[PDB]
Each structure stands twice: as structure tokens, then as C-alpha cells.
Structure 1
Amino acid sequence: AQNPNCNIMIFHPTKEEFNDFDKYIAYMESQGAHRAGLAKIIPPKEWKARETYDNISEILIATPLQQVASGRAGVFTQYHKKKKAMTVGEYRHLANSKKYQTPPHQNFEDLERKYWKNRIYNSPIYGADISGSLFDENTKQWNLGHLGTIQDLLEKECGVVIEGVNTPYLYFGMWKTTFAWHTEDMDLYSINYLHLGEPKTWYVVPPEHGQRLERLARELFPGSSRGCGAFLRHKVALISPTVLKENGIPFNRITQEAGEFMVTFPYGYHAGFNHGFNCAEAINFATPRWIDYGKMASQCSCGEARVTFSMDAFVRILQPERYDLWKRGQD
């Protein structure tokens, strides 16, 4: 079995290898990359996502989210308070202000220490989940707005024809902005490209051990657990590496820098934080190996998780028994 310790693997495709996206995913899995839940892909040196970023300040963040924490430093939840719209130029200036900027630090490890010590005492503002793309239309390789769609994968593998579309999302981060422990909708893959700015640190639990993380989360967040049988779908809970280590939960960590891709694999729980002002682009995708994960994915029916139009069809076709109850949640 390849990669039996479930380490995060890093890949350096050549420009030739960068032509066929699906093929390269299947290659990485041949090497065991999925066992980690997360892989890093460093693009060939000849590749570029776009010529410059010189004109991105005019993008609008219609609903910036202030991430307010509750709990203790290593075990907390965050709620998203909606703020007034602002442009990327306004948000970048805010990120760089004395109130919100990255503190002085020695290296990534020192910064990670300061994040876990101090996160809860601040409320950074995240421009998350903005439909759009920063890939140039002329970028033909690994252009996250030109991927094969999940609907088309389900049609090719299973023959069924469904409504729905699959588009990318932009994320504008600042110091301490946080993504809570989650898997993707329907336990899909994700791919995330860090277009510019400061790094993003990731934590990940191997898919084969995801239920260990779920059981810990039920113990640490016991009222949330009674409220919903899949409350990590709410994307609000944080658990630190120290707490994970104390409770024996297998995990890995890695820092993504500008110009790098990350892939999350089906049922790979992940969480993390941004080091400073940055912009990432991410999208979900599927392969044939996903289908079985899609069929088994948990679902939030309490009503909190409230997701996309396109997830309806996935539930309806892969999980017809759950369909009814999950749609009561969504309506």
C-alpha cells in the first residue's frame, strides 16, 4: 500500500505532465497521496495563472464576514458576523492596518504558535465564498474555471443527467482568518490555488481516520452534537493541534505559499488559517473514486448547513433515502 503513514505529499509536475488534469490526479493517487487527505502541487516553472494581479482592487466583497470566536484557545467555535460591503482595495488596506496586520514573528512555526495562543482574542474579517475567477482565460493548464464539472462526471460514470453547475470561488484573507474543520459538500474533492499574498497553513486528518475526529468533536462540542448528527457541516468548530495530539487524533500540517495548489481528497477533514492578506481560488471536483464517498457522505438536516443549488441533485441521485429529510432541512 502506498503512503501507509498518510503523509502529505508534494508534487512537482513538469509542463508536460500539467496538461491532463484528471490523469495527474489519478497519478498522485497511484502514489498514495489521497491517504493524507491533502496534497500540494507546485506548478511547473513555465506556468502562470495570469499575467499580473495589478488590477484586483476593484473586485467587491459584498458580505465580508467578521469571525468572532467563543471557547478556549484550543477548542472554540466561530460565528460569522456580516459586515458592510467593501472593495478588495479597501479590504487589503484594512488587513494591513495596525489592528489587523500580521505581528512580528521569527518564522512560520512562531507564527503558528501565536495563532493558536491568540486567535480567540481577535475577530479578523474574511472575504469568503465570492463567485468568480482570477485565472486568465488563456491559461489552459489547471485553470480552475475550466475543469470538467461534477455533473458531467456523474453522467459519465452513472449515466444520469442532472441540473446544476460547478463554478469557482474567491477567498480574500487576512491574519487569523480561519477555516473551520470540515470535509467538502458531499465529501467531494477540492482544489485551491493561492493566487497572491501571504501563506495559508492547513491541518488535515487522513480520510481513513475521519471518524476519530468526528468522535472527538462530539465530545468537545456536546450541545452542538445533540443538535445535529453532522454538525461539522456547519463549518464553525476549531480544534488545535495540541488538542488533537492530546487526544491521539492522527493529523498532518503544511503551509501553502502563493503560486501553489492544494488538493483535498474525499472525506479529508481540513482546517487552517491565513498568515496575512491573501487571495485564494477554490472549487470542488469529482473523479470516479469519489462516487462511493458521495453515496456515504453525512448530511446536516438541522437546517444550519444550507448549501448550493447543485447539491440537491447529488443527494437526490446518490442518497435517495436521505433526500426527503435533507430537503426539509434546506427548505
Structure 2
Amino acid sequence: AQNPNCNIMIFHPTKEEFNDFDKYIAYMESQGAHRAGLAKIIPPKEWKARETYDNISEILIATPLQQVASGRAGVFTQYHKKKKAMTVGEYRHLANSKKYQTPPHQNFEDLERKYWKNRIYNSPIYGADISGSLFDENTKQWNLGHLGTIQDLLEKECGVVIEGVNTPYLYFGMWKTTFAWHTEDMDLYSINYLHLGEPKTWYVVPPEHGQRLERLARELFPGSSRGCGAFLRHKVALISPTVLKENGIPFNRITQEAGEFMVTFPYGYHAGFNHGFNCAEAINFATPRWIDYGKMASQCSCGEARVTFSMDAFVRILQPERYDLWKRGQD
């Protein structure tokens, strides 16, 4: 068995190997990459996403989200308070202000220490989940707006034609902006490209050990657990590495820098934070190996998780017993 300790693997494809996206994902899995739940892909030196980032300031962040924490430093939830619209140039200036900027630090480890010590005492503003793309239309390799669609994968594997579409999302971050512990919708893959700015630190639990994280979360967030049998689908709970280590939960960590891709694998729980002003692009995708994960994915039916139009068909075809209850949650 390849990668039996479930370490995060880092790949350096050549420009020739960067042509065929599906083939390279399958190669990474042949080497055991999926066992970690997360892999890093450094693009060949010849490749670029676009020519420059000099002209992005007029993108609108229609609903910036202020991430307000409750709890203790290592075990907290966050809620998202909606703020007035602002442009990416306005948001960058805000991120760089004395109230929100990255503090002085020695290295990524010192910054990570400061994040876990102090996150709860601040409320950073995240421009998340913005439909759109920063890849140039002429970028032919690993262009997250030109991937094969999940609807087409389902149709190719299972024969059933379904409605829905699959487009990327932009994320504009600042110091301390936070992504809570989660797997993807329908335990899909994700791919995330850090277009510009400061790093993103990731934490991940191997898919084979995901239920250990879930049992800890039920113990740490006991009211939330009574409310919903899949409350991590709400994407609000944080647990620090120190707390994970104290409770014996297997995990790994890695920091993504500008110009690098990350792939999350089916049922790989992940969480993390931004180091300072940045912009990332991410999208879900599927392979043949995902179908069995999609059939087994948990679902929130309490009403909190509320998701895209396209998840309807995935539930209806892969999980017809759950369909009725899940759709009640959506309506």
C-alpha cells in the first residue's frame, strides 16, 4: 500500500505531465496521495495562470463576511456577519490597515502560534464564495474554469444525464480569515489555486480516519451535535492542532504559497487560515473513484447547510432514500 502513514505529498509535474489533468490526478493516487486527504502540486516553471494581477481591483465583493468567534482559543465556532459591499481594492486596503494586518513574526511557525493563541479575540473580514475566475482563457493547463464537469463525470460513469452546472469561486482573504473543519459537498474533491498574496495554512485528517474527527467534534460541540447528525456541514467549527493531538486524532499540516495548487480528496476533512491579504480560486471536481464516496456522504437535513442547485441531482441519483428528507431541509 502506497503512503501508509498518510503523509501530505508534494508533486512537481513537468510541462508534459501538466497537459492531462485527469491522468495526473490518477497518477498522484497511484502513489498514495489521497491517503493524506490533501496534496500540493507545484506547476512547471513554464506555466502561468495569467499575465499579471495588476487589473483586479475593481472586482466586487458584494457580501464580505465578518467572522465572529465564540468559545475558547482551541475550540470555537464562528458566525458570519454580512457587511456592506466593497471592491477588491477597498478590501486590500482594509486588510493592510493597522486593525487587520499581519503582525510581525519570525517565520510560519511563529505566525501559526500567534493564530491559535489570538484568533478568537479578533473578527477578520473574508470575501468568500464569489462566482468567477482569474485564469486567462488562453491558459490551457489546469485552468479551473475549463475542467470536465461533475455532471458529465456522473453521466460517463453511471449513464444518467442530469441538470446542473459546476463553476469556480474566488476567495479574498486577510490575516486570521478562517475556513472551518469540513469535507466537500457530497464528499467531492476540491482544487484550490493561490493566485496571489500571502500564504494559506491547511490542516487535514486522512479520509480513513474521518470518523475519529467526527466523534471528537460531537464531544466538543455537544448542543450542535444534538441539533444535527451532520453539523460539520455547517462549516462553523474549529479545533486546534494542540486539541487534536491531545485527543489522538491523526492529522497533518502544510502551508500553501502563491502559485501553488492544493487538491483535497473525497472525505478529507480540512480547515485552515490565511496569513494576510490573498486571493484563491477553487472548484469541486469528481473522478470515477469519487462515486462510492458520493453514495455514502452524510447529509445535513436540519436546514442550516443550504447549498447549490446542482447538489439536488447528486442526492436524487446517488442517495434516493435520503432525497425526500434532505430536500425538506433545503425548503
**Bin for the TM-score computed over the shorter chain:** over 0.9
1:101-120 per-position Cα deviation (integer Å, ceiling 9, x unaligned): 00000000000000000000
Once residues 311 and 188 of structure 1 are traced to their aligned partners in structure 2, the CA distance between those partners, rounded to angstroms, is 11
Once residues 132 and 22 of structure 1 are traced to their aligned partners in structure 2, the CA distance between those partners, rounded to angstroms, is 22
Report the 3-state secondary structure (helix = DSSP H, G, I; strand = E; otherwise coil) of the residue aligned with 1:194.
strand
State the shift of 1:163 in Å.
0.1
Report the 3-state secondary structure (helix = DSSP H, G, I; strand = E; otherwise coil) of the residue aligned with 2:191.
strand
Report the 3-state secondary structure (helix = DSSP H, G, I; strand = E; otherwise coil) of the residue aligned with 2:52.
coil
Once residues 258 and 284 of structure 1 are traced to their aligned partners in structure 2, the CA distance between those partners, rounded to angstroms, is 20
Once residues 155 and 106 of structure 2 are traced to their aligned partners in structure 1, the CA distance between those partners, rounded to angstroms, is 51
State the shift of 1:301 in Å.
0.1
State the shift of 1:121 in Å.
0.1
Once residues 321 and 130 of structure 1 are traced to their aligned partners in structure 2, the CA distance between those partners, rounded to angstroms, is 33
Once residues 230 and 196 of structure 2 are traced to their aligned partners in structure 1, the CA distance between those partners, rounded to angstroms, is 34
1:280-314 per-position Cα deviation (integer Å, ceiling 9, x unaligned): 00000000000000000000000000000000000
Provide the residue aligned with 2:185 in structure 1.
185
Report the 3-state secondary structure (helix = DSSP H, G, I; strand = E; otherwise coil) of the residue aligned with 2:192.
strand
Provide the residue aligned with 1:225 in structure 2.
225
Aligned residue pairs, count: 331
State the shift of 1:261 in Å.
0.0
Provide the residue aligned with 1:13 in structure 2.
13
Matches for 1:1-331 after TM superposition, within 5 Å: 1-331=1-331
Report the 3-state secondary structure (helix = DSSP H, G, I; strand = E; otherwise coil) of the residue aligned with 1:144.
coil
State the shift of 1:70 in Å.
0.1
1:117-146 per-position Cα deviation (integer Å, ceiling 9, x unaligned): 000000000000000000000000000000
Report the 3-state secondary structure (helix = DSSP H, G, I; strand = E; otherwise coil) of the residue aligned with 1:70.
strand
Once residues 282 and 83 of structure 2 are traced to their aligned partners in structure 1, the CA distance between those partners, rounded to angstroms, is 23
State the shift of 1:86 in Å.
0.2
Runs of 4+ in structure 1 over 6 Å off: none
Once residues 144 and 194 of structure 1 are traced to their aligned partners in structure 2, the CA distance between those partners, rounded to angstroms, is 12
Q: Give 5+ residue unaligned stretches, structure 2.
A: none
Percent identical: 100
Once residues 17 and 151 of structure 2 are traced to their aligned partners in structure 1, the CA distance between those partners, rounded to angstroms, is 25
Q: TM-score with structure 2 length normalisation?
A: 1.00
Report the 3-state secondary structure (helix = DSSP H, G, I; strand = E; otherwise coil) of the residue aligned with 1:219.
helix
State the shift of 1:214 in Å.
0.1
Once residues 4 and 58 of structure 1 are traced to their aligned partners in structure 2, the CA distance between those partners, rounded to angstroms, is 47
Report the 3-state secondary structure (helix = DSSP H, G, I; strand = E; otherwise coil) of the residue aligned with 2:152.
helix
Report the 3-state secondary structure (helix = DSSP H, G, I; strand = E; otherwise coil) of the residue aligned with 1:80.
strand
Once residues 141 and 54 of structure 1 are traced to their aligned partners in structure 2, the CA distance between those partners, rounded to angstroms, is 22
State the shift of 1:171 in Å.
0.1
Report the 3-state secondary structure (helix = DSSP H, G, I; strand = E; otherwise coil) of the residue aligned with 1:166.
coil
State the shift of 1:159 in Å.
0.2
State the shift of 1:215 in Å.
0.1
State the shift of 1:72 in Å.
0.1
Once residues 134 and 260 of structure 2 are traced to their aligned partners in structure 1, the CA distance between those partners, rounded to angstroms, is 14
1:176-208 per-position Cα deviation (integer Å, ceiling 9, x unaligned): 000000000000000000000000000000000
State the shift of 1:321 in Å.
0.2
1:40-90 per-position Cα deviation (integer Å, ceiling 9, x unaligned): 000000000000000000000000000000000000000000000000000
Q: TM-score with structure 1 length normalisation?
A: 1.00
Q: What is the root-mean-square deviation of aligned Cα atoms in Å?
A: 0.1
Report the 3-state secondary structure (helix = DSSP H, G, I; strand = E; otherwise coil) of the residue aligned with 1:26.
helix
Once residues 245 and 56 of structure 2 are traced to their aligned partners in structure 1, the CA distance between those partners, rounded to angstroms, is 40
Once residues 63 and 317 of structure 1 are traced to their aligned partners in structure 2, the CA distance between those partners, rounded to angstroms, is 33
1:239-291 per-position Cα deviation (integer Å, ceiling 9, x unaligned): 00000000000000000000000000000000000000000000000000000
Once residues 303 and 44 of structure 1 are traced to their aligned partners in structure 2, the CA distance between those partners, rounded to angstroms, is 43
Once residues 11 and 227 of structure 1 are traced to their aligned partners in structure 2, the CA distance between those partners, rounded to angstroms, is 41
